[PDB]
Amino acid sequence: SEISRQEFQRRRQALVEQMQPGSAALIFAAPEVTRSADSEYPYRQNSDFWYFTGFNEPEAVLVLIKSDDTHNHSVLFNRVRDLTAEIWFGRRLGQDAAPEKLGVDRALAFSEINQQLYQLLNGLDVVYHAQGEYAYADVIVNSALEKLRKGSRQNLTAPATMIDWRPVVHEMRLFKSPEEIAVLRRAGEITAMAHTRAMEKCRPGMFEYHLEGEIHHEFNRHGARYPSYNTIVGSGENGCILHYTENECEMRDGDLVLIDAGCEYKGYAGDITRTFPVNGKFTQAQREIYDIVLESLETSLRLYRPGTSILEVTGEVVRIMVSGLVKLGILKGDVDELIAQNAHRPFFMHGLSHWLGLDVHDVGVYGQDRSRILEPGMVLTVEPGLYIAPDAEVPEQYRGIGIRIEDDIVITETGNENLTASVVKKPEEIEALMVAARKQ
Template structure:
């Protein structure tokens, strides 16, 4: 009795927490949001605060969502949010606008009249429209779900903008992209006119370098989301390895990858899947994926999912038959060694585009010289024709940096060798061998962590995995 008496407040507390958590998830469902592992509102809030600190006093920032794009006639491409706008809001809706002001602005919204530094403008809720195109946050939902200080419908931004600009010396607004269209294009044009019509001179600047500077280093919360995307993409690759056989089509491997990716909850591929066999293995961004696979060929599979807006980027190269030929293995091992040697150098302070890239180039050059594929050492560049890698984040080719690595950045390391058929002076046994191995590394305090470690990468390990026929996870 006593024991129960003592435990019960604890049980009540636990039950209350559980209930509120489930109520929370349930109420978001009213806005069409069912996932419970999105980045928290505090992440986006802290990004907005960092940006406000960087723009200093008397400045206003306006950011806006991506446009919707027609695929054909009445059909639109699936909407994909603008990365910089997403990074500041967590909002995945079109026709949305964010105003940040270093001077407080007085607003009246669904929660009353108060002074704020941030207002998000979104489409109003409209049951008729939502029946066609899906549930929306609406202003109340934007405050509740995204945690912005204030929100209004996207027809009401003008007054707030005038108020914010009335005391501002500078307006930070991105230049509209060339393909801007629809409602957001009208809004951006209108903002330009409003700014010009103000009775005082306001300096117009771009905020993108500030936001992109922030985006380079990933927070622990972002890394959690990114690791999930990596985990899902690795599962997809394992499935392709286990299912690959002579006579299948490239698009069937792609279908298996995309099935696993979506089955594990990723929303989209991070880029169109590249599944290139034989003569297509030497085409860097081949993605029509229509050819039949034949034993004896090699396949470059550059496939990765996007999870909760964050990209992944992984490539594996496998033999159709399950066993590399001697020539394929020789090329594969050079690329593998180049990647190993390059990854050893990845740590804070090192210049990726110089030291790391150079090391991979040396290994490829020496390997090709040794095999007799090249005779002149400068010629290795004819076969290793792309950069060694790039940062990954919201964009698969994420915001650029000067290449000097910082703790918390995620980079790909993706050396490759591609030898097309009929390459003059190169023995025909090397023709149509394309190999790319691409992994993601996280720069840590004293080195790096290979995020894709769990996916077979050594030639022998790939062959072993290909023998495990069947369905991943079974």
């Protein structure tokens, strides 16, 4: 699946729709980023710039100018073509090819932005700019506005009003189109296939990073070159560290391993977590904690639908958790009192759900305590977990267990669609999958 030329066009028009007349919106590309000395990390475009362009070069700026309700036009600033730079670092779109390729009206050289941008903003009333996003952008925009401010005698005038477009644009990104959902559907499949493979490859004596290697390879073979975030493979006590990325330990027979990994496919993030026994067989103590987390997830998948909220579903999860922990004697006392005391917090110390899209932790307003009413087209994670510290004052058998199970969903008209259920999570199905792989 992919995002069409027409879709990028629709998004741009949807933004312009909301802009005031006599205004321009400025959306800047991500800078290149040093890894060490003269080597740079693989380039990752700004998510918002990408959203409106699908253009993967640095030193580029989209300018959308609204004259009035029926008249608007677009200017791109981008890198000029350069034979020497392209012999070294590969091909550039240039100015001639850009209008047709990216559906913009005009394309100018980024090297001329300071000579041209103030002319585009001259006489406008409003400029939409994400102030503080990038320092190079702020310098360019402030420089433009100062020229206009100080150019009274040359009949120049600056727009007096600057508006942050991030609220508006992030509100757009919160609701996925059918194309975006199709792309996320494929990202979920690719990520699921990686997680299945890691379960099938896991043996005692392999290192945590070996499963990372397996996951990244499977991403790559379906055309998702990069992960959406740094892969987490926490075996044993490392499963209690939420964003454990060291992945440096030998995986031991008897321990669980928690894998939190997601591919980036056409810009969009998958995000799955599966926890499983390194030796293919859950112990009683491991099953006792796993079942509480699995019930939390399964109940959440039942409940998520238009008209509820992350907060409301989280309340049901907390009840399931506190009840389970009381039965194991990890918590002591009255369930409802323990709930009112937030007694689950030593063991479940993060949110159940975050928005998902072009960013793994996606943009969009949550409301207070994530109370926002859910609507169709919202995409989110469902990731309950229980993490019992090595030193927790609880029965010995539960200490140092970290379990998280995560699926990705889209809210539909009548409920949700699960994008990641192609990798197993019922414990008997996990064990059957690993047994089958160990034969072969």
